[PDB]
Amino acid sequence: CTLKSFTVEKGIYQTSNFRVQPTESIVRFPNITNLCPFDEVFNATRFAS
């Protein structure tokens, strides 16, 4: 198919290229730190007026 001829001569011919497609996909981000004080804000006795 890469050559317009049904009678291929003797030799080596370069066909289309191959590419191994990936299977898995990982997304690694930096460690979770520096939390917010919202846990202490929403927990009190006298909040505001």
Add this chain to the structure above:
Amino acid sequence: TMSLGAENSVAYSNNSIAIPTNFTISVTTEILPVSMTKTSVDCTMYICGD
């Protein structure tokens, strides 16, 4: 200004010839390339990467 070489003046008498009396076997060298490195580009990878 570059010099084209030495300025030698060979005699040109009517009857005079220079016959060598000694021989010197010299071995020179010449560098000539034969071929390059065979390469082949990926027309589907260089144009589009992932």
